[PDB]
Design a protein around this ligand. Structure first.
Ligand SMILES: COC[C@]1(OC)CC[C@H]2[C@@H]3CCC4=CC(=O)CCC4=C3[C@@H](c3ccc(/C=N/O)cc3)C[C@@]21C
Lengths: 243, 13
């Protein structure tokens, strides 16, 4: 386990820098101020995800249309996954670490106005704690999330996409092989980690539904039409590791 | 609405 594989070290090196929400924690929370900070933090993280993708081996070789499609389909999962990692890493998964300046502990969640959403997102960090996910496993898993959903008709650079996905799958195995020595144990951990990824498909639509309803509550038939493919099943093709 | 943001961000740098 000593030496970390080059590709994994590369992934760590391209991890975006800390992103701040720009939230003023010296003032009492309000439903509006917290929603405002999340949207601001969200846009910043999105641009960060796009930048990150540009340094990911194999990504820029895909048709630009596939690149756009993949980011569109996975930004929510990537963000909730990163949130889970920060929460697990910095606060033992005991609270939601959206940013250094936006951390919601249990009490803060209960009074945020979106407590149910908090409990759902909290599921990821809690699972990270149980599994004790390593930084190496995390980095490989995150790339797989970016490559976990495609159009029903597939992509333009389909073969290239599949080889890119297959490579990071192999890399996840190396990551696991670092602490898991044994063919039965390493195999079992692969199932656990990838099963966790399969389970995110359902969770992600929950987040998109909450996003839409938060929008509706601020203000249509057209906006709702463009969001359904993100909350409804059968509109895209999730790539499951297990039946 | 993000497609526009994503598309523009991908071309840039
Ligand atoms: C109260 O929540 C409102 C949401 O929706 C109202 C529904 C789910 C949120 C995203 C959850 C994951 C996430 C993780 C982070 O580390 C920061 C922000 C974040 C979310 C937020 C978010 C806002 C804007 C954007 C992109 N804008 O271009 C991305 C993410 C808010 C929602 C979507």
């Amino acid at each position: 386990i000593q030496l970390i594989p080059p590709l994994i070290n590369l992934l760590m090196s391209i991890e975006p820098d800390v992103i701040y929400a720009g939230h003023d924690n010296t003032k009492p929370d309000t439903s509006s101020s917290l929603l405002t900070s999340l949207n601001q933090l969200g846009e910043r993280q999105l641009l960060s995800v796009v930048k990150w993708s540009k340094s990911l081996p194999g990504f820029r070789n895909l048709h630009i249309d596939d690149q756009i499609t993949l980011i569109q389909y996975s930004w929510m999962s990537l963000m909730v996954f990163g949130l889970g990692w920060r929460s697990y890493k910095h606060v033992s998964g005991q609270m939601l670490y959206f940013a250094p300046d936006l951390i919601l502990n249990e009490q803060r969640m209960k009074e945020s106005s979106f407590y149910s959403l908090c409990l759902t997102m909290w599921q990821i960090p809690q699972e990270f704690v149980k599994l004790q996910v390593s930084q190496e496993e995390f980095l490989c898993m995150k790339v797989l999330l970016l490559l976990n959903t495609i159009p029903l008709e597939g992509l333009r650079s389909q073969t290239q996409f599949e080889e890119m996905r297959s490579s990071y799958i192999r890399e996840l195995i190396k990551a696991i092989g670092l602490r898991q020595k044994g063919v039965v144990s390493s195999s079992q951990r692969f199932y656990q980690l990838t099963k966790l990824l399969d389970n995110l498909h359902d969770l992600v639509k929950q987040l998109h539904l909450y996003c839409l309803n938060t929008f509706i509550q601020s203000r249509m038939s057209e906006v709702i039409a463009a969001q359904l493919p993100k909350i409804l099943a059968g509109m895209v093709k999730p790539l499951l590791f297990h039946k | 609405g993000l497609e526009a943001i994503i598309r523009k961000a991908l071309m840039g740098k």
